[PDB]
């Protein structure tokens, strides 16, 4: 709601002051990374 | 007459030596270690 307006039913956080000031917003939760990795596990080496 | 026998016979030590002789003249190189048996196959994810 802003006031001294001619305009109703306004949504979405503004570009005005999106932190009230306050500090960054703080999640904890996971993740996954599943990926190709190249990586020569034991071969490609002096047998002795 | 037979000492040539009973000699070739006997002072069949140093022959060691003169192999190495050999080898001290010889190139060496190793062979790094090889991955047998098949492998595994990886197509592509469904890409749109």
Do not use: C, H, M
């Not at chain 1, 599943?34 to 490609?44: A, E, W």
């Amino acid at each position: 709601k802003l006031t001294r307006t001619r305009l109703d039913r306004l949504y979405g956080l503004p570009a005005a002051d999106p932190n009230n000031g306050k500090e960054y917003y703080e999640i904890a939760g996971r993740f996954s990374l599943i990926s190709l990795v190249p990586s020569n596990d034991d071969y490609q080496t002096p047998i002795a | 007459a037979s000492l040539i026998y009973r000699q070739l016979l006997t002072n069949s030590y140093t022959v060691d030596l003169s192999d190495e002789i050999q080898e001290i003249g010889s190139t060496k190189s190793q062979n790094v270690t090889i991955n047998p048996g098949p492998f595994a196959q990886t197509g592509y994810a469904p890409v749109n």
